[PDB]
Amino acid sequence: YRRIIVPSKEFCTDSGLVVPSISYELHKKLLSVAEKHGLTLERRLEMTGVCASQMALTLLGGPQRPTVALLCGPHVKGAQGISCGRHLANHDVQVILFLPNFVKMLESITNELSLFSKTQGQQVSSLKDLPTSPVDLVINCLDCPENVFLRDQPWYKAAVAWANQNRAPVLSIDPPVHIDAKWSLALGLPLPLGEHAGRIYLCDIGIPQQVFQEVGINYHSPFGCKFVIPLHS
Amino acid sequence: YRRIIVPSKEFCTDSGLVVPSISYELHKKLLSVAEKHGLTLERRLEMTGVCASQMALTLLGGPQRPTVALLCGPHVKGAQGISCGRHLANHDVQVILFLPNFVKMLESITNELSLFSKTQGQQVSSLKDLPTSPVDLVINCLDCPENVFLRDQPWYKAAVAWANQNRAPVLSIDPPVHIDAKWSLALGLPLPLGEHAGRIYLCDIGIPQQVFQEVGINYHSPFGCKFVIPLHS
């Protein structure tokens, strides 16, 4: 039944609990309020990396080491990818992180890269440095909602072309609404993601119940004991 | 076999991998270097809360709601308990958090309580406000290594007495070396915890391989695909 009421796609859990989508703006408002009450970006980046890497370890079978190609953009969504990549590298996954070069440094990127640099992971700026043969998993964090001209950039188009030619299944962490992912990972509550997001999962990102209430969402947890759950149309 | 070499108790994993203890001083050094490289306290508090709550949810049976009494001190170890408590509350566990009153405020406590206040959790400063009947789980975060006189304090002795009389099993998150815990949770690498720690588990707190090397530890992950693992003598 319906325990989450928003003030547009609707999903349900394995147990039948309805989880509706929220708009980009309401998701942004929710996170801002969460941040005001002490759930900082750095905290969320850390938790998102742990919980995403747990999901990806499940996708990798979770018993040579499996190989993951991580495709990150120069934005906060790409920083979430680097966190996930560091946690995977910490757990003996062969991680190759692609991130194009840029000039305007971003705090979250700088911080995640600093920790990633101390792992056995490989950071590359060229798509040619990525494996030729299909990897076990591609993780896609190339696109960000705030960069409307990002999808027109040659570097982006090449990265997408690389993912399509590799043949490994694609997990997209926190993709935008408008690469065909095998799976996609929504955070907190889903945006109205469509068929190109593939199999949709939801990740808990630490948001207390009353933060939802403050933005006019009547929220009850759809997670049970799990931090990442499958969602169905 | 031995893939973790330190410059004192030794544990092993289910698969036979040897995990040695390290001194308090080396553990402190390890985390300081981790911090220097961007693994801030706030990130670790969030991660520790997630992974400890995941462990606690397994102890709770991982399916009325289960009930947890959280006993925290006015210190960083107590802040780790509050983090675990907020994550449990987010997952529909009935959480009652004990923290005694104090005057010298602490950033980590303040930030964790701010988030916990927005959950359905209950914060209390009196032991009489805790259940009269056995709860499902007691989580102990009462003691901290930095305070040698803490155990002499009436408030602490009372809290320990409360835990001993409740009948519920006790999980101790990150206890000091010198309450008989059923299980204890070590972080990153274990201290030489003895028999009063009960069944010892190790939690991944997100520390990259090369941070260990910088403090003289030849480290290889004992975790496999798990973020919390049981250790045996």
Curated annotation (Swiss-Prot), chains A, B:
What is any one of the record's Gene Ontology cellular component terms? cytoplasmic ribonucleoprotein granule
The main location is cytoplasm
Q: Its Gene Ontology molecular function terms?
A: identical protein binding; mRNA binding
| A single BP term in Gene Ontology | deadenylation-independent decapping of nuclear-transcribed mRNA
Give the top-rank taxon of the lineage listed in the UniProt record for this protein.
Eukaryota
Q: What's this protein's family per the entry?
A: Belongs to the EDC3 family.
Question: What is the protein name stated in its UniProt record?
Answer: Enhancer of mRNA-decapping protein 3
Organism (species): Homo sapiens
